[PDB]
Design a binder for this molecule. Structure first.
Ligand SMILES: CCCc1[nH]c2nc(C)ncc2c1Br
Ligand SMILES: CCCc1[nH]c2nc(C)ncc2c1Br
Ligand SMILES: [Cl-]
Ligand SMILES: [Cl-]
Lengths: 341, 341
């Protein structure tokens, strides 16, 4: 076969990160389908090949494991499926139809990568140990591999959702109300909290629109990404609040503040769930130390970094914990953050 | 002379970090003066030589500057002053008397090191530029050099204050009331704020003693270090609060929470001074970017790290800023953090 040659070829190119503005242009209408096709048939084999080349540079004890070999085989087959469209005529509507179907197949083929990679981390822990050096190398790899996974699925979702034969532009909402996304994630976490604990903290949301007080805070963003981050944080905040008050009756609420500045849109979640000692904070974002015989927090932070944001945790042991999602307020500053190869 | 030989010799030893318990033993009585003397005449030339060896490894464009050469000459003269006591009899009370006087001289000789080192940073910026790589190397050096300065002055202060011919043990208060230290630093910052701005925010302190609610929070610590950190934070919080409300009448207070957990003693300061964009947060701790034609925040963080703590900043642009001082709650966990050589 030619898979090694394709990896070598397309890995010589750097991924081209896109801004929110560029995403809104690719999705502005159905006429852009041909442009999206000619862009993606080149960009997807670049992004695939770059992460596939990094996967081949892993130590032999990692590379030869069934999980890494299984993931590799998926990224080889996906790479080859895109290779078929490099010679096809974009003017043939059938070519465009086949391309969209191929992307859906690729997306589904990789649906179980995150659980498959977690199995590998557990195997490593039991086969070679959970030492700090291993933690750093695994953390470095998975942060980049998961960041690479997010950027590829973003490209695929934008094409398949928009060119299917409007206010939202695929997965992007140009008028995303952050508080509405905050109330959706809470309600879902609450539903689970009531089922498991038969009790749930209330929610308090406050908005600070510095430039235009009292005006609802809106932004251009991917609400599914924002939901994932807030849902993961709400689940942790509710578990901590309920469990730390099992012997008392009062249940402090979870407070959320949504602040809009000149360049930051910040979302702080605050609970009184007893807190975490500083020594144990970084373990919460570690793939290796979070793997036991999930990855919500580390992946949530990658969603935040993906458009030049961040997700940070600050606790006060004996009281509670704060989490801040930092997002870019302006679509001009919202640009893909891709692994530096 | 023999200064290079002494540096080479004593730099082969690792500094011996001390715990709070060990500090309280050296200062438990005046009979320990001889023990403190025999320990310090060996430990001080180890700590001096180790940082002096790192200073000699700086690039030639840094090492040959007047500021670095001036600081070096002080650390050479200080090293040699301790060398004189290596052969003296600890049983001779005169030897002990001379040793204490020598330490006071050494301490005063280095009193202007922090302003002298800042002049060097400014010279570098104008002579070679303010690029990121330079920022990291300078930050790495000064964090270790200033951490090394703190640990040496701690040793000297404990000897000179206790053996001068009790509740507090030198600079250590075994029953330090954190809230009392918080109210002292605020009052001082307030006095300056009223002079410069003719207006100052109020203070609100809340304590959370998780294990024993309502009981005042005490710890073993160096209150002068805690004062320095809180004073620096209060000055920034007051400046931000006042300046961001010059066009309004309400002046939000500065809130402080003092939480005591099983291993952390955490102090959170919260203001509504308009906040800082995430992009600019790290510049606040940078020596190079804080130098303009002071160093309170970076040095404050070193005081926190010195006994295994930390100082972290989290802002919300358009609203305000939080700062958390993390300290170890237990004297057993409060151990000197010295530069890794
Ligand atoms: C908004 C903060 C969410 C939160 N709260 C927590 N409490 C404990 C005890 N551990 C982890 C977490 C996390 Br993540
Ligand atoms: C307790 C937080 C103290 C604080 N507040 C600030 N506000 C601005 C605008 N810049 C820097 C700081 C700092 Br440091
Ligand atoms: Cl994947
Ligand atoms: Cl010094």
């Amino acid at each position: 076969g030619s898979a090694p040659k394709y990896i070598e070829h397309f890995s010589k190119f750097s991924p081209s990160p896109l801004s929110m503005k560029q995403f809104l242009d690719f999705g502005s209408s159905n006429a852009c389908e041909k442009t999206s096709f000619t862009f993606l048939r080149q960009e997807l084999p670049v992004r695939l090949a770059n992460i596939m080349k990094e996967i081949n540079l892993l130590p032999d004890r990692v590379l030869s494991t069934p999980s890494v070999q299984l993931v590799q085989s998926w990224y080889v087959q996906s790479l080859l499926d895109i290779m078929e469209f490099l010679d096809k005529d974009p003017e043939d509507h059938r070519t465009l139809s086949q391309f969209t179907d191929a992307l859906v197949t690729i997306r589904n083929r990789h649906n179980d990568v995150v659980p498959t990679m977690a199995q590998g981390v557990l195997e490593y822990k039991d086969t070679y140990g959970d030492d700090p050096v291993s933690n750093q190398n695994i953390q470095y790899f998975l942060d980049r591999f998961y960041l690479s996974r997010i950027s590829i699925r973003m490209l695929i979702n934008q094409h398949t959702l928009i060119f299917d034969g409007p206010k939202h532009i695929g997965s992007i909402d140009p008028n995303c109300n952050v508080s509405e996304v905050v109330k959706d994630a809470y309600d879902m976490a609450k539903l689970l909290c009531d089922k498991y604990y038969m009790a749930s903290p209330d929610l308090e949301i406050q908005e600070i629109n510095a430039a235009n007080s009292k005006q609802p805070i809106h932004m251009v963003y991917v609400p599914s990404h924002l939901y994932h981050m807030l849902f993961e944080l709400f689940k942790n905040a509710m578990r901590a609040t309920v469990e730390s008050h099992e012997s008392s009756l009062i249940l402090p609420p979870i407070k959320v503040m949504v602040a809009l500045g000149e360049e930051d849109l910040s979302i702080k979640m605050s609970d009184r769930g007893g807190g975490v000692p500083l020594r144990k904070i970084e373990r919460l974002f570690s793939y290796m130390y979070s793997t036991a015989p999930g990855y919500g927090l580390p992946i949530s932070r990658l969603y935040a970094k993906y458009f030049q944001g961040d997700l940070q945790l600050f606790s006060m042991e004996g009281f509670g914990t704060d989490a801040v999602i930092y997002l870019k307020a302006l679509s001009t500053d919202s640009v893909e953050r891709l692994p530096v190869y």
